Amino acid sequence: KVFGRCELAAAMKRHGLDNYRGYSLGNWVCAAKFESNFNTQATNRNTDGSTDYGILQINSRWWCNDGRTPGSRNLCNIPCSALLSSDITASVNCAKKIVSDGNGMNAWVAWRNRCKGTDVQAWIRGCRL
């Protein structure tokens, strides 16, 4: 599923991500924009053999099991495929773990490089929330 901007904002709020660990909804929407272009089915292989899955490009090196990432962990206790669903529940639950891991949203390199410090409120502007 390819979310619209306000549509994703609403689903993230519904699942308790707005202001989670102090990150406003615009931060989460901006990260989703540049990680997946709002596409729940996005997958991308990393040079180290791991793969990033879903709307927030969660990495199989640490967070989900895809059965082909040697030495990886599965700290969200989830098949990586569950992160590709049209319902964003699993991606949100796992992202909550990731953003609580110590480095905040810097875990998402695209967030650090493209959202951090910017006018992230633009991403929810005009949204009925």
Point out the annotated binding site for substrate.
101
- Looking at the Cβ atoms of 48 and 101, the one nearer to Cl ion is 101
48 a catalytic residue: no
52 a catalytic residue: yes
DSSP helix/strand/coil, 112:
helix
Gap between the Cα atoms of 78 and 81, Å rounded = 8
AA identity, residue 89: T
Q: Give, as ranges, the residues between 42 and 81 that touch Na ion (CB under 5 A).
A: 60, 65, 69, 72, 74
Sign of the CA dihedral 116, 66, 68, 55?
negative
- Looking at the Cβ atoms of 26 and 54, the one nearer to Cl ion is 26
DSSP 8-state assignment for residue 67: S
Q: Looking at beta carbons, which residue is closest to Na ion?
A: 72
Residues that bind Cl ion (CB under 5 A): 24, 26, 104, 120-121
